[PDB]
Amino acid sequence: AGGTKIFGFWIYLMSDCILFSILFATYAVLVNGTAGGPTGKDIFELPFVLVETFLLLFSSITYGMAAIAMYKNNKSQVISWLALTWLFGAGFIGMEIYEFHHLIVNGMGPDRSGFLSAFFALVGTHGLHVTSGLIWMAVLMVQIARRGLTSTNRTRIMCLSLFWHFLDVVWICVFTVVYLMGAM
Amino acid sequence: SHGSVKTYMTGFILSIILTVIPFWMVMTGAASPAVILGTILAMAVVQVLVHLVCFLHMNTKSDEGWNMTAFVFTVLIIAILVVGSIWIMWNLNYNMMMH
Amino acid sequence: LSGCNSALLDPKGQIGLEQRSLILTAFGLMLIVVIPAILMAVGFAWKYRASNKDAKYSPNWSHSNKVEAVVWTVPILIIIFLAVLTWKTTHALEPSKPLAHDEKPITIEVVSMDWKWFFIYPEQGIATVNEIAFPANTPVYFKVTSNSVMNSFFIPRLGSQIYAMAGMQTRLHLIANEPGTYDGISASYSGPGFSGMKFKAIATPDRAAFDQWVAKAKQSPNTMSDMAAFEKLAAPSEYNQVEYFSNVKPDLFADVINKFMA
Amino acid sequence: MFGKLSLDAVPFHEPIVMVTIAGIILGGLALVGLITYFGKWTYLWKEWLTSVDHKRLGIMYIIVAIVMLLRGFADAIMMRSQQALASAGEAGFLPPHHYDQIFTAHGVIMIFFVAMPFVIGLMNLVVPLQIGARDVAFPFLNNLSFWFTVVGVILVNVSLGVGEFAQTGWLAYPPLSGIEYSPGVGVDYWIWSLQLSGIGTTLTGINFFVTILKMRAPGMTMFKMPVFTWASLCANVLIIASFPILTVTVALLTLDRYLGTHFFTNDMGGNMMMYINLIWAWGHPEVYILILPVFGVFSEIAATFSRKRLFGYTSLVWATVCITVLSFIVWLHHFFTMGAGANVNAFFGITTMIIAIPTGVKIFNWLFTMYQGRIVFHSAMLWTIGFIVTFSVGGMTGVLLAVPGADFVLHNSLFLIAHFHNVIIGGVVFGCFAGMTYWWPKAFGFKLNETWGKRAFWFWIIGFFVAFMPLYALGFMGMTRRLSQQIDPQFHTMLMIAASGAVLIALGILCLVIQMYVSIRDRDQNRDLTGDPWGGRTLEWATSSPPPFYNFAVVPHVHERDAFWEMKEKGEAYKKPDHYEEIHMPKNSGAGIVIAAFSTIFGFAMIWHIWWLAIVGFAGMIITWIVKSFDEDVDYYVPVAEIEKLENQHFDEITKAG
Ligand code: HEO
Ligand SMILES: COC1=C(OC)C(=O)C(C/C=C(/C)CC/C=C(/C)CC/C=C(\C)CC/C=C(/C)CC/C=C(/C)CC/C=C(/C)CC/C=C(\C)CCC=C(C)C)=C(C)C1=O
Ligand SMILES: CCCCCCCCCCCCCCCCCC(=O)OC[C@H](COP(=O)(O)OCCN)OC(=O)CCCCCCCCCCCCCCCCC
Numbered sequence A: 001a002g003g004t005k006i007f008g009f010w011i012y013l014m015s016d017c018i019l020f021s022i023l024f025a026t027y028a029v030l031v032n033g034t035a036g037g038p039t040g041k042d043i044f045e046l047p048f049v050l051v052e053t054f055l056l057l058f059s060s061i062t063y064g065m066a067a068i069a070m071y072k073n074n075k076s077q078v079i080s081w082l083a084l085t086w087l088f089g090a091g092f093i094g095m096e097i098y099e100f101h102h103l104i105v106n107g108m109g110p111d112r113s114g115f116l117s118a119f120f121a122l123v124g125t126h127g128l129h130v131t132s133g134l135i136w137m138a139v140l141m142v143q144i145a146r147r148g149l150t151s152t153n154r155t156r157i158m159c160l161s162l163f164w165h166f167l168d169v170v171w172i173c174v175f176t177v178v179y180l181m182g183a184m
Numbered sequence B: 001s002h003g004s005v006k007t008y009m010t011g012f013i014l015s016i017i018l019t020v021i022p023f024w025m026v027m028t029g030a031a032s033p034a035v036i037l038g039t040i041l042a043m044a045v046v047q048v049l050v051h052l053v054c055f056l057h058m059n060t061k062s063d064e065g066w067n068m069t070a071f072v073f074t075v076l077i078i079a080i081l082v083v084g085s086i087w088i089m090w091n092l093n094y095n096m097m098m099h
Numbered sequence C: 001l002s003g004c005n006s007a008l009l010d011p012k013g014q015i016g017l018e019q020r021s022l023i024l025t026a027f028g029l030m031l032i033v034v035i036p037a038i039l040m041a042v043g044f045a046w047k048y049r050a051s052n053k054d055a056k057y058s059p060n061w062s063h064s065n066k067v068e069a070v071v072w073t074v075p076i077l078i079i080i081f082l083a084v085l086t087w088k089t090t091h092a093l094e095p096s097k098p099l100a101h102d103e104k105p106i107t108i109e110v111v112s113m114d115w116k117w118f119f120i121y122p123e124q125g126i127a128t129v130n131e132i133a134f135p136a137n138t139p140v141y142f143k144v145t146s147n148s149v150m151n152s153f154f155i156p157r158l159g160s161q162i163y164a165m166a167g168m169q170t171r172l173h174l175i176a177n178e179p180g181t182y183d184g185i186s187a188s189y190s191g192p193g194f195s196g197m198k199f200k201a202i203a204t205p206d207r208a209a210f211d212q213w214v215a216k217a218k219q220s221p222n223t224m225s226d227m228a229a230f231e232k233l234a235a236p237s238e239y240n241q242v243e244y245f246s247n248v249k250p251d252l253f254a255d256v257i258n259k260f261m262a
Numbered sequence D: 001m002f003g004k005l006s007l008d009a010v011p012f013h014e015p016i017v018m019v020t021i022a023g024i025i026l027g028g029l030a031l032v033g034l035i036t037y038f039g040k041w042t043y044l045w046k047e048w049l050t051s052v053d054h055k056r057l058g059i060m061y062i063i064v065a066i067v068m069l070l071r072g073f074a075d076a077i078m079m080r081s082q083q084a085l086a087s088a089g090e091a092g093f094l095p096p097h098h099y100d101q102i103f104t105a106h107g108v109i110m111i112f113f114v115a116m117p118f119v120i121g122l123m124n125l126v127v128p129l130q131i132g133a134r135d136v137a138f139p140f141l142n143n144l145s146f147w148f149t150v151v152g153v154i155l156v157n158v159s160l161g162v163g164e165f166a167q168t169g170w171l172a173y174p175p176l177s178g179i180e181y182s183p184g185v186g187v188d189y190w191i192w193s194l195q196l197s198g199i200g201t202t203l204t205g206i207n208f209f210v211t212i213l214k215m216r217a218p219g220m221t222m223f224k225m226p227v228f229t230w231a232s233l234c235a236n237v238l239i240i241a242s243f244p245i246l247t248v249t250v251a252l253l254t255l256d257r258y259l260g261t262h263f264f265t266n267d268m269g270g271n272m273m274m275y276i277n278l279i280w281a282w283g284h285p286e287v288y289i290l291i292l293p294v295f296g297v298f299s300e301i302a303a304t305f306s307r308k309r310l311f312g313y314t315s316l317v318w319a320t321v322c323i324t325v326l327s328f329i330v331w332l333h334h335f336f337t338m339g340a341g342a343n344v345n346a347f348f349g350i351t352t353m354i355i356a357i358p359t360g361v362k363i364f365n366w367l368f369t370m371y372q373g374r375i376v377f378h379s380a381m382l383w384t385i386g387f388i389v390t391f392s393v394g395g396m397t398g399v400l401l402a403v404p405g406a407d408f409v410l411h412n413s414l415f416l417i418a419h420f421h422n423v424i425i426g427g428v429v430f431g432c433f434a435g436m437t438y439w440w441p442k443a444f445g446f447k448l449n450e451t452w453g454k455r456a457f458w459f460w461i462i463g464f465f466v467a468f469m470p471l472y473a474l475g476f477m478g479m480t481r482r483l484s485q486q487i488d489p490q491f492h493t494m495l496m497i498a499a500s501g502a503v504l505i506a507l508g509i510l511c512l513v514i515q516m517y518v519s520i521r522d523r524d525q526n527r528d529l530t531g532d533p534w535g536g537r538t539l540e541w542a543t544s545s546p547p548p549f550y551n552f553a554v555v556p557h558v559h560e561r562d563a564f565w566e567m568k569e570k571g572e573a574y575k576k577p578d579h580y581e582e583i584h585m586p587k588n589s590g591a592g593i594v595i596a597a598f599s600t601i602f603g604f605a606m607i608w609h610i611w612w613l614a615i616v617g618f619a620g621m622i623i624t625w626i627v628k629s630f631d632e633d634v635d636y637y638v639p640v641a642e643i644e645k646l647e648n649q650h651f652d653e654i655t656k657a658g
């Protein structure tokens, strides 16, 4: 039964790797499409990008503790370590929408250049993936608390372990190709 | 399959010495841009590698082997669609200037 | 797979004549593995069909080597010589590569407007729509661009084609070895009225006949001497007939591209 | 309703599009009448629509393709007539506003909806049967995939009814598809029909990958699988890897058409060459998603009707695997004329000829499966002998386009058109018709009529060479794709011969309908009982005529390559076991049509700018999905009594005719 879905979800994650790859090529070309607008060094508040990363690097260790607790059959600890993970992902999403709001209400929106478009669609897509992961983790804690740690909810914790840790793997390529390699 | 509390807290105490060093070099300025770009990219592959090794626990013994195989094949499709597209659109942009 | 008096199999240009001898080389480098493959599909389906009790029936014969290695080396020994030929011709028929000749190229700047072509002569100063002219046995320098959706400048009887994008200068080099009036078209769909982007490349027999064509071109009340006159020749129209303008603004082709780049 | 929707969007004064949308609204309602009269609405909800069963989903995938092969062909036979009228004086009957919606809605349909769910329709019906599995790895994801293919049909079959379709070509290009040169909702119908059908076909490429990998019988190694399963495995690595390039190249166009971004415009940073690059980075790999499962349909028809083991099994597998990886480094041969250098044109022009060596070795392996055999001339083998002749020419003229020196004069022109019709009509379409008549006894129980299947081949292959060889002599005369007005009268005599060939194809589609009708009527005489009508070799011929809902009562124990022709050769075929065990089958789920029905609302609202409705549709797609996870009843145990009954019926049918 299980394990076949985890492998299918890993294959979906590979398709997702390629999806994000297409967005890293569109940004690699349109990074200098900054016609009369703001270049990379001008809008990237680098400290604000660091605090995001540490809100997502904690979002992987706090889930790892949830997986360890699930392997220890400690449902209460699973909920406690999943509720804390949803609190760092929520902070990352809050800072992401705050950045996308500081950019839009100052004219530097997605329709200003080819750069900001290639920047709002690459970081914005990662934000959409993270918020989908948050919707998934919230609709999963409802099932862990309701039923328990049944054979169908142990797969969803491991199917989310791949998805949630992978979002922090893409981010290692996001702050180093968009923010670091841009504000350099 | 399973990851101990030592698999974590060793990919977490190592991923902070890889999310600070580039975020410090490229921030305060410590070397020539030819070495900064190499550091923030060599440490950007080592961190992804340590994540794949200790967060999405990825051995060769999973799924009869089709767990590292699918990834290694997917990297070959990214390195072909990215390096290919960048090469093409560098040859296309140059050949359409005001020569 | 036919046409003895067609365009591509009877070109009148050097860029076109060296591509015909390239199509006829590939067509013949592949009839070595296609004429057998089509002859074998018919000769094997007949000799061994169901009722021919005169052949060998061996339903235990999959792995061979004399028939597996010689069948996986003729495609290779063909593609190899079809690959070095590809490389040599590609590095010789490139659009950007200037033609070798002891005569200065006549630069023509091609703006693909909305369902009409616009040819600027920056040296003579004339700028005609839906018609070019250049002496035979004389290279030309097409600097093709677009004012609208992506078109494709194509003169089938003279040689290659090159796309045309809004802010972008793509270069093409053609030459007419014989005089005449060669048809031109747009080789990429461009919208409702794309079927009317049809110009005529009048190749003059000598230079004296080309100067007298510029003469009749520089004898018109029209005048393309401002950008507000170019934007007048941009109202979406179809089947634009030949129209000769007059003294043109210097660096006009550079002003068309320098509006999708600001 | 709200948004841009209004009666000024339905074509009322246009005569042609008024009869059509009054015929489909008449046919689609006569269908409801026929269904409700016979009372077959409950049976068409508990058995077919809400069905997690690869057999009943691989028949509903094909019914869509067949019922839209007619919708896509009427686009052809009309733009074949306009070019025959516009070439000699008369203006015609299709103004350039209504013709440009024809060659667009004909490439979008006959690729994504007549060729894609006909290749997937066979990879669904037969692949779970060959490997010895009782169902795909993810049953519910298969019903949802199908209903996400239909959700892209209710958006293209409605585009001619309310609004218009794209006027840009089947791969709508950036500067012409932007909101400044195509502002009407014709590209939004092109966007949300390929997007809501790409999300659905990516999930069906993950099914058959995991199915072929981790659902095989106990003993079928990766080098004992059937060649159709191997090709359907290599054609899903091209779905998982390439279709993500489509869900972005389209999604980047929506933002360019909705939020006013500057991805693909020509001003303020946008490169309108990045779309032409990405859409072909997917475009090419997508043409090997269609031709690889057809390289399997023909690998088993030749090895079956010739009564001979497939020549060089281990050389056909190392050709499909090559083509699977060699199809990602060739995608630039579609815009050789764009203006790239001489080192990238020539590089992408060599790697697209190296991909012809595996295809040649594949074509030559089939020639030696027929070398020393007994080639039964059943209509399914008639296509294969015709597929070789109709695909060698296509490949020959396509490698001649792979030369970027001969691709400058043979770019978009009536020489390009007839190559991807030579390799599709001679390829995919022949394979989609050779695999439809070869597995028809395994999908319904009776055998297709033969004296009409033969007449359906001699009009499709004769009506091709007399309908596209004229479109081969026109590329050398200097014609262009997508011409519909005032065609130079020099192209006349070649466009009338090319029109009198689509009439023979139409007669070859009428023959298909007559064949289906006669075979469905006279089923009680052309009936297949033993489950092995042709003398097959793979495991799908070990079942009954229609294999039961569970494929195999006991999962077969494979020991050799031809898993069934090896059991049937040694005698261990049709043997009855001692004790059956209850099967663990999935449960028919009706939450896949609802996620899809809630997706047409989202698409039809994002097209017509109905935001209050797009929000509701999007929520309904992620509310029927949240509540589907709380459904803790998704499987049931098929008891041993029903298995005993079915197996005893089958063994009775066998032993009474031995
Ligand atoms: C089923 C789909 C399909 C298939 C299988 C093919 C097969 C091939 N196609 Fe075609 N194509 C397909 C569908 C399309 N092609 C297109 C366009 C297109 C273009 C663009 C040209 C231009 O820029 O306009 C090129 C260069 C090719 C080349 C090829 C090649 C090299 C193959 C090779 O696979 C063919 C190899 C087969 C051969 C060679 C076997 C026969 C020969 C034998 C017996 C082997 C012996 C060995 C040698 C001869 C090498 N195709 C388009 C454009 C869409 C649009 O814009 O309209 C489509 C849809
Ligand atoms: C905007 O313009 C457009 C259209 O306008 C027409 C479209 O239709 C379409 C397609 C939409 C559709 C609803 C068309 C789909 C339906 C069809 C039939 C497609 C056309 C098919 C063909 C040309 C091939 C033939 C296919 C068939 C299924 C034939 C149907 C079956 C039969 C028996 C037709 C009979 C025709 C005959 C000439 C023989 C009949 C003669 C007799 C029975 C003799 C006795 C006479 C009587 C009256 C009893 C598009 C996409 C479009 O863009
Ligand atoms: C913008 C459009 C995006 C479209 C959808 C994304 C938005 C919301 C994402 C989905 C909603 C949140 C998560 C789903 C809700 C509950 C899912 C769940 O129950 O998880 C358990 C399930 C485990 O599998 P199982 O339990 O067996 O499934 C049976 C029934 N589902 O888990 C599963 O195996 C299935 C769940 C997989 C999660 C997929 C999430 C993908 C995120 C995609 C973001 C889109 C980004 C846009 C890209 C375009 C490019 C510009």
Ligand SMILES: CCCCCCCCCCCCCCCCCC(=O)OC[C@H](COP(=O)(O)OCCN)OC(=O)CCCCCCCCCCCCCCCCC
Pocket (backbone or CB within 6 Å): A004, A005, A006, A008, A009, A012, D137, D138, D139, D140, D141, D142, D144, D195, D196, D198, D199, D202, D203, D206, D247, D251, D595, D599, D621, D625, D628, D634
């Ligand atoms: C950019 C597009 C924008 C368009 C708007 C957004 C569209 C979303 C609206 C549609 C909702 C998404 C599809 C809903 C179903 C998702 C698939 C699913 O439910 O997974 C089920 C599968 C297990 O199901 P199974 O084992 O077969 O048995 C059934 C037991 N419940 O679980 C598995 O085994 C895992 C295998 C697949 C994992 C999830 C599949 C894809 C994830 C969601 C797709 C979201 C689409 C976004 C981008 C598309 C690319 C895929």
Ligand code: HEM
Pocket (backbone or CB within 6 Å): D073, D076, D077, D079, D080, D103, D104, D106, D107, D108, D110, D111, D114, D115, D168, D169, D170, D171, D417, D421, D424, D425, D428, D429, D480, D481, D482, D483, D502, D505
């Ligand atoms: C049934 C016989 C068919 C006929 C008569 C036919 C006819 C045509 C015609 C006339 C065109 C446009 C020619 C032009 O652009 O000038 C065309 C384009 C096309 N056809 Fe077909 N076709 C047929 C079958 C198919 C099949 C089977 C497929 C794929 C499965 C297919 C896919 C396409 C595509 C992708 C285009 C490109 C449309 C565009 O330019 O946007 N066709 N067809």
Ligand SMILES: [Cu+2]
Pocket (backbone or CB within 6 Å): D283, D284, D287, D331, D333, D334
């Ligand atoms: Cu291709």
